[PDB]
């Protein structure tokens, strides 16, 4: 069945902001190499401090974001930058989840704890992403010598 955590809750999907999640799949041809998200503090009200990292060529890169959580919704802000996402799927143990990136032509992403194990859950996330983004070429951001 591949039934995951329901109802879907962004905070729960992020392991209550106690873990780092890496981007493993994306329909975005602009997806950044090694894009990783990690907690950078405790949960301020419905907001969560997050440090996003990635690699540009051989150089590591960094940015700080404020996540605003509302159920399954995630509003990420940095300066004048605002990114809206909706966690559409969340694995049983909150090991991996699938996001819809809100925009003119929406993109879909698969994030997961940076660890092995719970491979059936990983497969389920992959399956849910295929459903949401069927027919879309996928990129593998974490498979870039990260
Ligand atoms: C809080 C731990 C991180 C969980 C991962 C959240 C995942 O579902 C995606 C949610 C928000 C991602 C924000 C995207 C920010 C872009 C980072 C790269 C860049 O644009 O510079």
Swiss-Prot record:
A cellular-component GO term for this protein: extracellular region
Source organism phylogeny: Eukaryota, Metazoa, Ecdysozoa, Arthropoda, Chelicerata
Subunit-structure text: Interacts with complement C5.
Residues that, per the record, bind leukotriene B4: 32, 65, 85, 97, 99
Organism listed in the record: Ornithodoros moubata
Domain of life of the organism encoding this protein: Eukaryota
Protein name: Complement inhibitor
InterPro entries: Calycin
Any one Gene Ontology molecular-function term assigned to this protein's record: toxin activity
């Amino acid at each position: 069945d591949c039934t995951g955590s329901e109802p879907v809750d962004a905070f729960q999907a992020f392991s209550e902001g106690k873990e780092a999640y890496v981007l493993v799949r994306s329909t975005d041809p602009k997806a950044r190499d090694c894009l990783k998200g990690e907690p950078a503090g405790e949960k301020q009200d419905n907001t969560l401090p997050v440090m996003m990292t990635f690699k540009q060529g051989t150089d590591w890169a960094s940015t700080d974001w404020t996540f605003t959580l509302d159920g399954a919704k995630v509003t990420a802000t940095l300066g004048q930058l605002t990114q809206n996402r909706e966690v559409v799927y969340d694995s049983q143990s909150h090991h991996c989840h699938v996001d819809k990136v809100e925009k003119e032509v929406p993109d879909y992403e698969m994030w997961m704890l940076d660890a092995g194990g719970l491979e059936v859950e990983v497969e389920c996330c992959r399956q849910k992403l295929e459903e949401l983004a069927s027919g879309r070429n996928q990129m593998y951001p974490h498979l870039k010598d990260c």
